[PDB]
Short mmCIF file of N, CA and C in Angstrom, two decimals:
data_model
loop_
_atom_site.label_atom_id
_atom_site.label_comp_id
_atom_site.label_asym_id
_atom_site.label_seq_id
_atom_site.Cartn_x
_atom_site.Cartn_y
_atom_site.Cartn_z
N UNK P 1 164.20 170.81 123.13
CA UNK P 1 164.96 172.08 123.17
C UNK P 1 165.20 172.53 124.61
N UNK P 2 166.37 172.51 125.37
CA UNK P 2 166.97 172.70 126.37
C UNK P 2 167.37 172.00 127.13
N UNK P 3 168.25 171.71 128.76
CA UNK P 3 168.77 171.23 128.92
C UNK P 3 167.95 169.96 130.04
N UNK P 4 167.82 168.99 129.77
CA UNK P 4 167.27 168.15 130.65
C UNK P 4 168.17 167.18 131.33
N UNK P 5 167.71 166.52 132.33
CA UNK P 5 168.62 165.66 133.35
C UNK P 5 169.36 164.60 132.16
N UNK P 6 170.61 164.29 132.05
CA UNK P 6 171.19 163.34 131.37
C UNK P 6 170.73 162.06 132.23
N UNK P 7 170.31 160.94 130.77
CA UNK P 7 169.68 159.93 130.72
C UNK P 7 171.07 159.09 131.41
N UNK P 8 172.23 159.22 131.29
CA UNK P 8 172.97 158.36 131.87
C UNK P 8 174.60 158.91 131.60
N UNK P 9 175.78 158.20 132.54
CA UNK P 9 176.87 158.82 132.32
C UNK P 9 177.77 158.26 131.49
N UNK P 10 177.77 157.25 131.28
CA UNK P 10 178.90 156.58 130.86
C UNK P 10 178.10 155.68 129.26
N UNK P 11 178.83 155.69 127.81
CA UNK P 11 178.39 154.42 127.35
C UNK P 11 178.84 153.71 126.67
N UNK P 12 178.72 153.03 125.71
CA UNK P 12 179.83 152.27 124.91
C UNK P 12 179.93 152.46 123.40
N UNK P 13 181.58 152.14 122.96
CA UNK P 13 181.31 152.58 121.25
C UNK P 13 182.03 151.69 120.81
N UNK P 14 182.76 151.55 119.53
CA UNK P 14 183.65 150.72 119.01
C UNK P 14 185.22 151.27 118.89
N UNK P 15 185.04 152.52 118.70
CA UNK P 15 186.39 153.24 119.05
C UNK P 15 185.87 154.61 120.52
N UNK P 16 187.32 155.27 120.52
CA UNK P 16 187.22 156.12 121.33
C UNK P 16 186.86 157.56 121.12
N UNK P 17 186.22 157.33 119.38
CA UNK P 17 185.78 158.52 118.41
C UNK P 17 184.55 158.63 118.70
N UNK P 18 184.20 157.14 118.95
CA UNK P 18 182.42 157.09 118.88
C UNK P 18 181.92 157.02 117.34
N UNK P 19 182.73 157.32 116.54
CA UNK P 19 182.66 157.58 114.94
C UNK P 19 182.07 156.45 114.11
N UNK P 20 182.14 154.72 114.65
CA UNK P 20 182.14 153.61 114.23
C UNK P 20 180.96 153.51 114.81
N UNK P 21 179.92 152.98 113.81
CA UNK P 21 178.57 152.09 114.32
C UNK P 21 178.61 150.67 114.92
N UNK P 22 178.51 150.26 116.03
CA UNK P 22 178.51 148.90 117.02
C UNK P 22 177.41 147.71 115.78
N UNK P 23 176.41 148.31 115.69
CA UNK P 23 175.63 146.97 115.84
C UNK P 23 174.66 147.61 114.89
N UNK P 24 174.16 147.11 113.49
CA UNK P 24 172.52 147.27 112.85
C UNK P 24 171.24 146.91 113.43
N UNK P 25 170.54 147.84 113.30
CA UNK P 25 169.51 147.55 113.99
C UNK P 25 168.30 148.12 112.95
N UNK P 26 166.92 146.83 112.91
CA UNK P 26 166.13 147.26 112.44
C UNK P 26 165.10 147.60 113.24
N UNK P 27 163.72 148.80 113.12
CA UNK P 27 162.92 149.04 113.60
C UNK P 27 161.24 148.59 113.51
N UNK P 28 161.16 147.95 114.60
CA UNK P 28 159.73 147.14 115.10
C UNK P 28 158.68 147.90 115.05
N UNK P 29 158.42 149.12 115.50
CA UNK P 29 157.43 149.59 115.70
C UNK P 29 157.84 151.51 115.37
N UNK P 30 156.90 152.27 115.59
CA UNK P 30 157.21 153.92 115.06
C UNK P 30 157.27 154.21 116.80
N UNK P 31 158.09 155.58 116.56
CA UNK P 31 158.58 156.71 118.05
C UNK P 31 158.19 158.28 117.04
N UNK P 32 158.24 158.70 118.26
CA UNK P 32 158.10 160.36 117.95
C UNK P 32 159.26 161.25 118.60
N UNK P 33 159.82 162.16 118.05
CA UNK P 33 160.99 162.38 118.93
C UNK P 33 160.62 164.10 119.99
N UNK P 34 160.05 163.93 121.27
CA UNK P 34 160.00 165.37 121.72
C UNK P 34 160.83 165.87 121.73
N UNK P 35 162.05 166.32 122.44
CA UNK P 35 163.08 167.15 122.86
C UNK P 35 164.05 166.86 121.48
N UNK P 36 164.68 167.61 121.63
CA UNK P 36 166.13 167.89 120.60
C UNK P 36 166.99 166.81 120.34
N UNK P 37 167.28 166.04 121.74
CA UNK P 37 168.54 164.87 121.21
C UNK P 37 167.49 163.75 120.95
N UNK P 38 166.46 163.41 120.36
CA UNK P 38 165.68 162.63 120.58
C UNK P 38 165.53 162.45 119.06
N UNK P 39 165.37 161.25 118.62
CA UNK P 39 165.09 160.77 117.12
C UNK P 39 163.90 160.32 116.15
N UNK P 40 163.30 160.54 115.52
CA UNK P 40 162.05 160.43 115.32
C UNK P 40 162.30 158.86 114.29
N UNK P 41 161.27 157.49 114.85
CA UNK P 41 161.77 156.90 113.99
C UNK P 41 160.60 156.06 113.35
N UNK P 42 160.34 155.95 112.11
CA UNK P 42 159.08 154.73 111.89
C UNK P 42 158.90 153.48 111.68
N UNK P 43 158.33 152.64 111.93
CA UNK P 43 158.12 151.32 111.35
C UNK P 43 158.86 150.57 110.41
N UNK P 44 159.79 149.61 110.41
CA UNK P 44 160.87 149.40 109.35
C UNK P 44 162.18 150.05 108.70
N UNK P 45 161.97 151.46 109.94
CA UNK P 45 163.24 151.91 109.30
C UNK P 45 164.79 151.35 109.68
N UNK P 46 165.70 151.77 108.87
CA UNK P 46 166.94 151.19 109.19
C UNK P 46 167.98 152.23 110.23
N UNK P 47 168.07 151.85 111.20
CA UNK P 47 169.25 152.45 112.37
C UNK P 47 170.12 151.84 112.91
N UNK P 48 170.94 152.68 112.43
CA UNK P 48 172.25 152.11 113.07
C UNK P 48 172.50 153.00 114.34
N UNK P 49 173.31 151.77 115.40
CA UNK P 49 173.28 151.92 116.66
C UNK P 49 175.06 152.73 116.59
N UNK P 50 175.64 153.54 117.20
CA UNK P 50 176.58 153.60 117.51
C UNK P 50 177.01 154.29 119.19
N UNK P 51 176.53 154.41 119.83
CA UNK P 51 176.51 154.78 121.53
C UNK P 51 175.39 153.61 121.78
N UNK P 52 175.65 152.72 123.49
CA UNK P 52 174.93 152.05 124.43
C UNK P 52 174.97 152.74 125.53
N UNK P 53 173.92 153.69 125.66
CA UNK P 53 174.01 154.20 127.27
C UNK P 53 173.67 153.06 128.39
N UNK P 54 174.48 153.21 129.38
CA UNK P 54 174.96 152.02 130.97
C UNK P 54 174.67 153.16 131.98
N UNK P 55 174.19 152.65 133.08
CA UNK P 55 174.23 152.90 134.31
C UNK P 55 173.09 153.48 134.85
N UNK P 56 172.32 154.71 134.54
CA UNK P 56 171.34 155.25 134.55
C UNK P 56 170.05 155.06 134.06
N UNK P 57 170.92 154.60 132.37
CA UNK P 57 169.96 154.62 131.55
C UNK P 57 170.85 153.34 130.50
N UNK P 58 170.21 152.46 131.41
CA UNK P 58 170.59 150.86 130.54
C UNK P 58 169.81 150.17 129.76
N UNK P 59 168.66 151.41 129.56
CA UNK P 59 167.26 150.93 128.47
C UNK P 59 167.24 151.85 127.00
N UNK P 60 168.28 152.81 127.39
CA UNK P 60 168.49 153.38 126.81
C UNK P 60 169.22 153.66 125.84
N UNK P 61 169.69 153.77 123.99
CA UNK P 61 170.48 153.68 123.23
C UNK P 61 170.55 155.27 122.37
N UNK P 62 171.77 155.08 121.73
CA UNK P 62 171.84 156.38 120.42
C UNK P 62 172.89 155.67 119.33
N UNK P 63 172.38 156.62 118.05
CA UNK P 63 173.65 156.38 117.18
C UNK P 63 172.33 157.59 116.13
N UNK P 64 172.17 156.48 114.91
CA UNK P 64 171.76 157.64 113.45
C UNK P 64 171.00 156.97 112.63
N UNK P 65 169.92 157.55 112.16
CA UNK P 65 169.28 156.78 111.33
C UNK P 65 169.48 156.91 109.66
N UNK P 66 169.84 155.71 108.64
CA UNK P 66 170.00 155.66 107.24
C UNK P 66 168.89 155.44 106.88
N UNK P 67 168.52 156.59 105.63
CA UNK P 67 167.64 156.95 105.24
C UNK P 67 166.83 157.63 104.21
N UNK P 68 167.00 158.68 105.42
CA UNK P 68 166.11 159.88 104.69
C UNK P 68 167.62 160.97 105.52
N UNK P 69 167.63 161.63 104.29
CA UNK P 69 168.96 162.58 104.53
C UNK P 69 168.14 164.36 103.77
N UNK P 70 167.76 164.28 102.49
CA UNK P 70 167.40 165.67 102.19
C UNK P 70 168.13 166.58 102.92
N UNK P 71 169.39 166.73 102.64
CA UNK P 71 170.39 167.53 103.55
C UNK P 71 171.52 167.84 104.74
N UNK P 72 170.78 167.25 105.76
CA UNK P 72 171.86 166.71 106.67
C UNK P 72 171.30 165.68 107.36
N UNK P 73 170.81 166.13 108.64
CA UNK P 73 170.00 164.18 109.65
C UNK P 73 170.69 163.92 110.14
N UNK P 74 171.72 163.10 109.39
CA UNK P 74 172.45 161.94 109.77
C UNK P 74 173.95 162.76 109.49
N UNK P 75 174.12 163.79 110.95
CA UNK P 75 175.17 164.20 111.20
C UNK P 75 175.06 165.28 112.78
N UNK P 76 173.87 164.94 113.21
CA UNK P 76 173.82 165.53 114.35
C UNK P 76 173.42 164.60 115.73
N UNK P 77 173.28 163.59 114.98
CA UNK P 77 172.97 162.18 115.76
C UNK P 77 171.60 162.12 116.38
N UNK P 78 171.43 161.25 117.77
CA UNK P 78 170.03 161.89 118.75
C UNK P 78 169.90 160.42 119.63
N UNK P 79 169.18 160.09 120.39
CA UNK P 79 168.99 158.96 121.14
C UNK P 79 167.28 158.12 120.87
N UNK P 80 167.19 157.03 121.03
CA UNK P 80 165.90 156.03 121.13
C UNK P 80 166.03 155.01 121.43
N UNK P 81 164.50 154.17 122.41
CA UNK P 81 164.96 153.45 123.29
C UNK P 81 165.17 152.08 122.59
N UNK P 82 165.83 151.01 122.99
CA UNK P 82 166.20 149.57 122.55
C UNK P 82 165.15 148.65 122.19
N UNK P 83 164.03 149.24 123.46
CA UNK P 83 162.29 148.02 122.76
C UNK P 83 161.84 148.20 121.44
N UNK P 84 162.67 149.71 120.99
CA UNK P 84 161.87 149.89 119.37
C UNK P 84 162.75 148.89 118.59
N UNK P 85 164.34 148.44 118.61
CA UNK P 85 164.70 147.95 117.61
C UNK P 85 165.34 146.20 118.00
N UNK P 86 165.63 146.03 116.60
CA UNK P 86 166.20 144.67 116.83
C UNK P 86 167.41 144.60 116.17
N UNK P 87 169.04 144.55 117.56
CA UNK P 87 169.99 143.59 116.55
C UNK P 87 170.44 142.75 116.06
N UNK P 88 170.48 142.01 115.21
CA UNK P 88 170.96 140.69 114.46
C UNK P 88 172.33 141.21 113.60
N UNK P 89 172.57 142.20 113.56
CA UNK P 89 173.70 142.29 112.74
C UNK P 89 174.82 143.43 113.52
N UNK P 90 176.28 142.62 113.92
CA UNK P 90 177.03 143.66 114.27
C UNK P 90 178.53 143.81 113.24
N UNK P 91 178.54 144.76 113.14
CA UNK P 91 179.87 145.63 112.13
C UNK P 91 181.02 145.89 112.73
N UNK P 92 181.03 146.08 114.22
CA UNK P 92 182.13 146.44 114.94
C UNK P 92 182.35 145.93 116.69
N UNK P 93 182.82 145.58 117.39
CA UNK P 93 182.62 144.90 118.73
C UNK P 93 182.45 146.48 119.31
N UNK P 94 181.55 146.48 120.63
CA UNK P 94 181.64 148.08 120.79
C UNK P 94 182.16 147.42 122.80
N UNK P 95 183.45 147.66 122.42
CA UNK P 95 184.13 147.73 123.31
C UNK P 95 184.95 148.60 124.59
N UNK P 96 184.57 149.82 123.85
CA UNK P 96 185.23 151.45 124.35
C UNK P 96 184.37 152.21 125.17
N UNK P 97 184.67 151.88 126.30
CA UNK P 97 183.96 152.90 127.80
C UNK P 97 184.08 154.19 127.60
N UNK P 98 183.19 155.39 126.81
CA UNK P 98 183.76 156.75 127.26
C UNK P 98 182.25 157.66 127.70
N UNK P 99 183.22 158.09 128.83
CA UNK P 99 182.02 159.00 129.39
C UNK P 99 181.55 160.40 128.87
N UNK P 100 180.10 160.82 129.14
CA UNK P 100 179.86 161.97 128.63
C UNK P 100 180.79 163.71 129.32
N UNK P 101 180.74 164.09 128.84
CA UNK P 101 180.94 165.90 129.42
C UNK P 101 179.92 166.91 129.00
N UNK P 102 179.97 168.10 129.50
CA UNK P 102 178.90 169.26 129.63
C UNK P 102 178.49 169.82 128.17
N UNK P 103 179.00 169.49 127.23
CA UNK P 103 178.25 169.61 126.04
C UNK P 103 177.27 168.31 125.50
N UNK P 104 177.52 167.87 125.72
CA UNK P 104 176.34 166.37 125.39
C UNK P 104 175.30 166.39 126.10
N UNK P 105 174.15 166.27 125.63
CA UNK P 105 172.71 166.53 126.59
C UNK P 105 172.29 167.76 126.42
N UNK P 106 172.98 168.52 125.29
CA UNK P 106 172.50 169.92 125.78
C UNK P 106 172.46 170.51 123.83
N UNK P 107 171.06 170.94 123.68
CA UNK P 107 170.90 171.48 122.53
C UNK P 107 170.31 173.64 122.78
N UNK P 108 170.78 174.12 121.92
CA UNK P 108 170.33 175.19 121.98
C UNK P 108 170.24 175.72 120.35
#
């Protein structure tokens, strides 16, 4: 909850919506999510990747996790890092450079 240094500027998607998931990814091990854009994820769950953050933060990924919904979740998005998951399966080439602006990074 509030505004912290952005993890990176620029990253990649499959369109210029960002709307399209790049790549499936399953999860290796559990995360905890502190701050707001941050995703809480466990052991075996299923996430799909749709943002690759570059430049800053090239360890760094986002998209949404399928799941557990009870309402919404998986419509406000959030970020977690790449050592938790594994891709073997991609849905879309994520080819589309778009950079962030002053609402992204920032929850209130």
């Amino acid at each position: 909850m509030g505004p912290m240094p952005k993890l990176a500027d620029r990253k990649l998607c499959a369109d210029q919506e960002c709307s399209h998931p790049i790549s499936m990814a399953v999860a290796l091990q559990d995360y905890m999510a502190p701050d707001c854009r941050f995703l809480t994820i466990h052991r075996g769950q299923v996430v799909y990747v749709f943002s690759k953050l570059k430049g800053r933060g090239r360890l760094f990924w986002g998209g949404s996790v399928q799941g557990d919904y009870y309402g919404d979740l998986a419509a406000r998005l959030g970020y977690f890092p790449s050592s938790i998951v594994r891709e073997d399966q991609t849905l879309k080439p994520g080819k589309v450079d778009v950079k962030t602006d002053k609402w992204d990074f920032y929850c209130q």
